[PDB]
Amino acid sequence: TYETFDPPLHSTAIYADEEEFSKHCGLSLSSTPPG
Amino acid sequence: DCHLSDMLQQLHSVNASKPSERGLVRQEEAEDPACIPIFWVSKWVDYSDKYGLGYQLCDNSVGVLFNDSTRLILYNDGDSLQYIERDGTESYLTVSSHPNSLMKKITLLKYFRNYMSEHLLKAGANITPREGDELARLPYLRTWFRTRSAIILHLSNGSVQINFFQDHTKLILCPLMAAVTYIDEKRDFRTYRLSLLEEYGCCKELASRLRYARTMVDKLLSSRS
Amino acid sequence: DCHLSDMLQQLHSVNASKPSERGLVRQEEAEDPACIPIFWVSKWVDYSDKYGLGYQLCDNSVGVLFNDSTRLILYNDGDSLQYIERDGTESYLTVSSHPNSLMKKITLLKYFRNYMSEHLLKAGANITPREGDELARLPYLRTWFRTRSAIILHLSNGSVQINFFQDHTKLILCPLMAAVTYIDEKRDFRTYRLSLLEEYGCCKELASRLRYARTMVDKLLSSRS
């Protein structure tokens, strides 16, 4: 929001969602998996 | 506080039974999805060094507990407001009416709101509360404090929420239902009757977090002196 | 740079000799186990649609080439870190004593490393690389791209690795030694002197991929200068 509005502490950021991260990695291209 | 006193008695009873030291732990038999809370803190912003602590509830309403002990709530309609003064007096107004004495606090609240919607993840987004708005009087954040391991959030309806920093696990304790909702690292949500956890037991992770909860409720009770 | 120029001259020389169009091929005579590489990319995941490309090196170190041209390397100790800005500025921090500036990029790496470690296979598992850590500066991903048939990985030590998607064959080219290592479909690994392949020949599988390698290296240079 406002530029100088810089909270020092806050709850979990949107980027810190590993369930969503590990997922999109599975939908994107990657090296060879075990099989 | 009668609600805290009840929660303390409920937690002491279950913890004294040592729920994780049973021969066969049957945590699943304590599940009661009918006790799922109607309200919990989905987001929070600790700006207590300057303004205070802003937060979002699961209904997308937002509130701020300013450093002067007043509280301003913005209902999910985006215009209705509830103002709680130091002594607890409640008044109702709107952003549209333009009440001049509250303009600065309204502006700060909207910064909290915008910062949360823009940067922060909504806790409990994968689950539906118990009842709707009509049956749901909007609670407010009465008090809070931060420890090494968690932030403790006491709502005006008696609920006590505990978010653990290390693993993102969370507890939502309701003394009216004598229940606890647990959000694990995977974000799976389960609501249990404390009386049934005592009878059937529970795993060590929940048991230890319930011991932590009791320590925090004692702290909440001692700070009320 | 000059390493890509040396590699292009080496690839042009070997391809110009048509090593697979010989009356007799003695590929084994061109092997030189003294040129086995120290470093290569064992895992990678292309999240460039949002964050960038993460990868694992054979020494179990991890790196990420973010979309903002910055890099963050996690060494195999699990704590030390190296951050190469866009202007080449290198900074050696740790996950413990990390500035709040890199909190996000540190968290994203950990997610990359988590996904790679649990979901992806380690290329070159049966390998024993050369030397060790002493005077073995860890390389970082200088640049990368992928075609419909392969992914091209250019490391900071001048090495260029090409992984072919469909058959899982892989080339590891080292311009310092004029050597190439070929990983075939059976995951066998053989390191050759490009100059010797000129003199002894090789199967059409390796020869055809060395032709492809040269065009890829020409592409890496069309972007550099």
From Swiss-Prot, chain A:
It comes from the Eukaryota. Changing residue 12 to E: Failed to enhance the PLK1-dependent degradation. Phosphorylated by PLK1 at Thr-12, creating a self-tethering site that specifically interacts with the polo-box domain of PLK1. Disulfide bonds: none annotated. Expressed at high levels in the testis, fetal liver, thymus, bone marrow and at lower levels in the lymph nodes, placenta, colon and spleen. Present in all cell lines examined, including B-cells, T-cells, epithelial cells and fibroblast cells. Expressed at high levels in glioblastoma cell lines. The modification Phosphothreonine is found at residues 12, 32. Transmembrane segments: none annotated. It is found in: Cytoplasm; Nucleus; Chromosome, Centromere, Kinetochore. Changing residue 12 to D: Failed to enhance the PLK1-dependent degradation. Component of the CENPA-NAC (nucleosome-associated) complex, a complex that plays a central role in assembly of kinetochore proteins, mitotic progression and chromosome segregation. The CENPA-NAC complex recruits the CENPA-CAD (nucleosome distal) complex and may be involved in incorporation of newly synthesized CENPA into centromeres. Plays an important role in the correct PLK1 localization to the mitotic kinetochores. A scaffold protein responsible for the initial recruitment and maintenance of the kinetochore PLK1 population until its degradation. Involved in transcriptional repression. Belongs to the CENP-U/AME1 family. Component of the CENPA-NAC complex, at least composed of CENPA, CENPC, CENPH, CENPM, CENPN, CENPT and CENPU. The CENPA-NAC complex interacts with the CENPA-CAD complex, composed of CENPI, CENPK, CENPL, CENPO, CENPP, CENPQ, CENPR and CENPS. Interacts with MLF1. Interacts with PLK1. (Microbial infection) Interacts with the N-terminal domain of Kaposi's sarcoma-associated herpesvirus latent nuclear antigen (LNA). This is Centromere protein U. The gene is CENPU.
From Swiss-Prot, chains B, C:
Changing residue 45 to A: Loss of centrosomal localization and of S-phase progression. Disulfide bonds: none annotated. Residues 40-118, 140-222 form the POLO box domain. Changing residue 44 to F: Loss of centrosomal localization and of S-phase progression. The modification Phosphothreonine is found at residue 128. Placenta and colon. There is a cross-link at residue 122 (Glycyl lysine isopeptide (Lys-Gly) (interchain with G-Cter in ubiquitin)). Ubiquitinated by the anaphase promoting complex/cyclosome (APC/C) in anaphase and following DNA damage, leading to its degradation by the proteasome. Ubiquitination is mediated via its interaction with FZR1/CDH1. Ubiquitination and subsequent degradation prevents entry into mitosis and is essential to maintain an efficient G2 DNA damage checkpoint. Induction: By growth-stimulating agents. Changing residue 44 to F: Abolishes interaction with CDC25C and reduces centrosomal localization. The modification Phosphoserine is found at residues 5, 80. It is found in: Nucleus; Chromosome, Centromere, Kinetochore; Cytoplasm, Cytoskeleton, Microtubule organizing center, Centrosome; Cytoplasm, Cytoskeleton, Spindle. It comes from the Eukaryota. Residues 123-137 are annotated as: Linker. Residues 168-170 are annotated as: Important for interaction with phosphorylated proteins. It is linked to Defects in PLK1 are associated with some cancers, such as gastric, thyroid or B-cell lymphomas. Expression is cancer increased in tumor tissues with a poor prognosis, suggesting a role in malignant transformations and carcinogenesis. Belongs to the protein kinase superfamily. Ser/Thr protein kinase family. CDC5/Polo subfamily. Serine/threonine-protein kinase that performs several important functions throughout M phase of the cell cycle, including the regulation of centrosome maturation and spindle assembly, the removal of cohesins from chromosome arms, the inactivation of anaphase-promoting complex/cyclosome (APC/C) inhibitors, and the regulation of mitotic exit and cytokinesis. Polo-like kinase proteins act by binding and phosphorylating proteins that are already phosphorylated on a specific motif recognized by the POLO box domains. Interacts with CEP170. Interacts with EVI5. Interacts with FAM29A. Interacts with SLX4/BTBD12. Interacts with TTDN1. Interacts (via POLO-box domain) with the phosphorylated form of BUB1, CDC25C and CENPU. Interacts with KIF2A. Interacts with CYLD. Part of an astrin (SPAG5)-kinastrin (SKAP) complex containing KNSTRN, SPAG5, PLK1, DYNLL1 and SGO2. Interacts with BIRC6/bruce. Interacts with CDK1-phosphorylated FRY; this interaction occurs in mitotic cells, but not in interphase cells. FRY interaction facilitates AURKA-mediated PLK1 phosphorylation. This is Serine/threonine-protein kinase PLK1. It comes from Homo sapiens.
